[PDB]
Design a protein around this nucleic acid. Sequence first.
RNA 1: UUACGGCGGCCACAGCGGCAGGGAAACGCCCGGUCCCAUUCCGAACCCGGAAGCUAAGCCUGCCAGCGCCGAUGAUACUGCCCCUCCGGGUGGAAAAGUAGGACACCGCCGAACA
RNA 2: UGCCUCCUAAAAUGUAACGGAGGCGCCCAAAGGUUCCCUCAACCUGGACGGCAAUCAGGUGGCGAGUGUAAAUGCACAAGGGAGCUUGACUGCGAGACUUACAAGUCAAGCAGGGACGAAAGUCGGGAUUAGUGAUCCGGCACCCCCGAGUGGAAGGGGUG
RNA 3: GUUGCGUGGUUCACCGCGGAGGUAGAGCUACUGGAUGGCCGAUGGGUUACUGACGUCAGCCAAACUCCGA
Lengths: 134, 57, 178, 71, 48, 116
Amino acid sequence: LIPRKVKHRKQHHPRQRGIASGGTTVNFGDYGIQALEHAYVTNRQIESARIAINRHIKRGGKVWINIFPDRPLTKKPAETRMGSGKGSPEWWVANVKPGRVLFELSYPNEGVARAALTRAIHKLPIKARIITRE
Amino acid sequence: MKSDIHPAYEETTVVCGCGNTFQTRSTKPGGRIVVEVCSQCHPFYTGGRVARFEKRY
Amino acid sequence: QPRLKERYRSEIRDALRKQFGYGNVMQIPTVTKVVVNMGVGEAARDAKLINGAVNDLALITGQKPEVRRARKSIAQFKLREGMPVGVRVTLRGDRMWEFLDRLTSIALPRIRDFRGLSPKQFDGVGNYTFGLAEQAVFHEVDVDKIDRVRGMDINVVTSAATDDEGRALLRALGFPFK
Amino acid sequence: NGRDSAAQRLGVKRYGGQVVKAGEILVRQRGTKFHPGVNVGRGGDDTLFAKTAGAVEFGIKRGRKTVSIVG
Amino acid sequence: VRPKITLACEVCKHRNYITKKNRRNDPDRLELKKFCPNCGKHQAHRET
Amino acid sequence: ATRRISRLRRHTRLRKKLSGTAERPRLVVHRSARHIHVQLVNDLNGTTVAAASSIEADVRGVPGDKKARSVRVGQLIAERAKAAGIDTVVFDRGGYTYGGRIAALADAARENGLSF
RNA sequence: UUACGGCGGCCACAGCGGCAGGGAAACGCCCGGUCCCAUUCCGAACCCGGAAGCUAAGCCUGCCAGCGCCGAUGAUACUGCCCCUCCGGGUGGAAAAGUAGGACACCGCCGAACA
RNA sequence: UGCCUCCUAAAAUGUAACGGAGGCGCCCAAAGGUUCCCUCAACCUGGACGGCAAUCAGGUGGCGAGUGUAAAUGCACAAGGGAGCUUGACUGCGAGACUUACAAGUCAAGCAGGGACGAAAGUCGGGAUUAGUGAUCCGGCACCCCCGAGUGGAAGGGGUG
RNA sequence: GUUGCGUGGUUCACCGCGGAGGUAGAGCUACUGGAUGGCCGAUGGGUUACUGACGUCAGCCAAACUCCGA
Ligand SMILES: [Mg+2]
Ligand SMILES: [Mg+2]
Ligand SMILES: [Mg+2]
Ligand SMILES: [Mg+2]
Ligand SMILES: [Mg+2]
Ligand SMILES: [Mg+2]
Ligand SMILES: [Mg+2]
Ligand SMILES: [Mg+2]
Ligand SMILES: [Mg+2]
Ligand SMILES: [Mg+2]
Ligand SMILES: [Mg+2]
Ligand SMILES: [Mg+2]
Ligand SMILES: [Mg+2]
Ligand SMILES: [Mg+2]
Ligand SMILES: [Mg+2]
Ligand SMILES: [Mg+2]
Ligand SMILES: [Mg+2]
Ligand SMILES: [Mg+2]
Ligand SMILES: [Mg+2]
Ligand SMILES: [Mg+2]
Ligand SMILES: [Mg+2]
Ligand SMILES: [Mg+2]
Ligand SMILES: [Mg+2]
Ligand SMILES: [Mg+2]
Ligand SMILES: [Mg+2]
Ligand SMILES: [Mg+2]
Ligand SMILES: [Mg+2]
Ligand SMILES: [Mg+2]
Ligand SMILES: [Mg+2]
Ligand SMILES: [Mg+2]
Ligand SMILES: [Mg+2]
Ligand SMILES: [Mg+2]
Ligand SMILES: [Mg+2]
Ligand SMILES: [Zn+2]
Ligand SMILES: [Zn+2]
């Protein structure tokens, strides 16, 4: 996942503070992954988790990814001193706050759905839990 | 602005070949204007393969 | 004292009232203005419209038309903003009545292969538009004294509120539909 | 990168209730972020100076923020 | 392309104002009716 | 309708730079097809201090046409203003163009005492 | 005092839209282009002269929450200063969004009719 | 490497980095002054060549267009579009302010002369605003006739542009 | 900073009153961009089982977004 355009190529780091206020409830499916701590979730990790969910359920069901990695992060070349201009973008990041719902899942069977979401959670650099649409 | 801008515009006379005659004021044509067809004579204002085979044979 | 105007005021005003149940005489439709423009294209090319359009629209109508200039620029037409591209005149009043008469009576029938103007070319509010292609049927111009031929299109603006009302008004005025 | 222009020190110089003399500069601005009211002239570079002594008074004048001076 | 020009009073020849113009858009000397401090009134001025 | 809106626009546009006060009130005119109206406004408290119109004995004191009637009502307003104690005003076109009936009114008001 | 024409305050709680109703004076459309004046062409507009017609439109009155607008209380986000290792807590402020709901304006001066 | 605009910049002003983005070293004799008038872009429908888009007509459209040129703040009341006349893109000043180590930089009501436009009220000391620039020295040019190495001149200097 | 001569509460703290804001937060059919899932589906694609314009219904994001706003 990569945005097609960005208005600003190099940006400040997104701020890691506060509880999430939007997208904190399951809205598209029956089961979801809710974040319990701040972190920078990468498109690599997102694709890893999506593939884990799909290969566990193997068929049927629908998976929603309601975050997008559009905030870029830069990096200087390897062996360089400090301060000769900002580096070029090299990561794409979603800014995740506690309470945010990361993935959503619909599937008939409780146990398989929960196992698939646990598969996904073990790929993310966050403590997360599984929640349901009541 | 009307000083020397618009062309002449004075009474004329339309006469048609059929005979329908009226008069308005037109441009440079000095007096009478003679026309061949008008709204009072022109058409549209006044109104088989097997058949051909058999009429041939 | 335009005969088409008196025929209108004498029969058309109450014929239209009989047709559409106008409870007020102010509601009766009428033609307010007639607009003619050439819409020349040789703006970037040869830059001549001073006589190609002005010196004959004067002859067709009776008043000098206005020269229109492009509002923006288009590369696919070599059009650059601010240069003469169209010539328009606005007939209104007894001159408009006389032009309508002179058109419908002796000009419009003279069109070669004329079979009747379409009745579907109304705008949707009551205003009618149609086009020509040459310095023909207007007897005022002479083909012996013209450059390249060019057409025009005419807008007949009416106070009618609907296309059927406008069509009835023009049919009464003498526009041959089909 | 690396370039910038000088800070132009714009903004409001006299707030509501202050007693000014004639000729006081009230607002340095670009454009009419504020508009001149009574006894307030604009100025060549949109400066909103005072034409009379009195107290500055801000208000609304049908969409425009205006500065006036009460005698 | 836009040189500095000076305008002199027609009557007293005093060089009263200096300004700029485009030599191509205005290939000829300007005439303006400026105020002449010497003559004390408005007079015609011209380039030098 | 379009005429009303356009006249209002023109009136506001001229009104941007002309107020009228106690010592120098505003002279507003309102010209219809049949009559003409005028009043002095003093736009600090919105208080008319004198007013004349073409619905008076003026309606029959007619030496001719609408311009003559406007001359008469101008003579009336000048005297009413002097009676009220005013002698200098600012003329308000009202969005119309200065000339014809309005210019006749304004001139009559000028030679009959008002200084504007 | 009532109810119509103007000039302002104010600038959507006033706006947009929808449905009905009105012509005493007035405001309007309206009839003409000799006169002042006018159209990058047009008496359409601006101006001038009138009074055959009409409230159809403008304008005015009444009723509609449809679109738009306003909008609390409470809670929350955030936060000043303290306590406190953080986690958190005390004390002082306090949103935006959403909800209940409001709302098809109000006021001043002049003129006419009525008084 | 100087100047202008934005963000960083923590809701007055100010604030660093070899932090993030851009412009400038001009143009306009009208693109200045004034008086008067107008409202755009986009979309829909109809219309000869003509098409997604030239000109026309009618709807809808409160600013999404435009502004000489970057950005920001403005501007529909228009600072945006059109037209008539003009040279204030003045001379002598300037109370009072902003900014500021200093040197600089910026605004200014109003008075007088002589004018432009306007029926008047009034506006006009360049341009919607903020960049388009260089101290002092030493010289050049025009004007005033201030000094003139014994006197009268002159040279030379002085003043104002 | 200190010290001489002037000035004398002008400084500072607290309370009350009069003011300008666009940060934190939030919100976005209020703009410029990003962007998830439905529905309608322009074209492009081979009768369209592929692409998915513009719309529209829900959920979201932004130092250089702002109808707001401590
Ligand atoms: Mg949010
Ligand atoms: Mg984990
Ligand atoms: Mg700055
Ligand atoms: Mg030239
Ligand atoms: Mg009546
Ligand atoms: Mg007429
Ligand atoms: Mg009516
Ligand atoms: Mg009615
Ligand atoms: Mg509350
Ligand atoms: Mg709220
Ligand atoms: Mg309402
Ligand atoms: Mg800042
Ligand atoms: Mg600041
Ligand atoms: Mg601060
Ligand atoms: Mg550069
Ligand atoms: Mg300009
Ligand atoms: Mg303009
Ligand atoms: Mg001009
Ligand atoms: Mg100059
Ligand atoms: Mg000074
Ligand atoms: Mg003077
Ligand atoms: Mg001045
Ligand atoms: Mg300037
Ligand atoms: Mg500029
Ligand atoms: Mg030296
Ligand atoms: Mg000597
Ligand atoms: Mg000498
Ligand atoms: Mg001097
Ligand atoms: Mg505050
Ligand atoms: Mg900001
Ligand atoms: Mg934030
Ligand atoms: Mg948005
Ligand atoms: Mg923000
Ligand atoms: Zn015939
Ligand atoms: Zn001289």
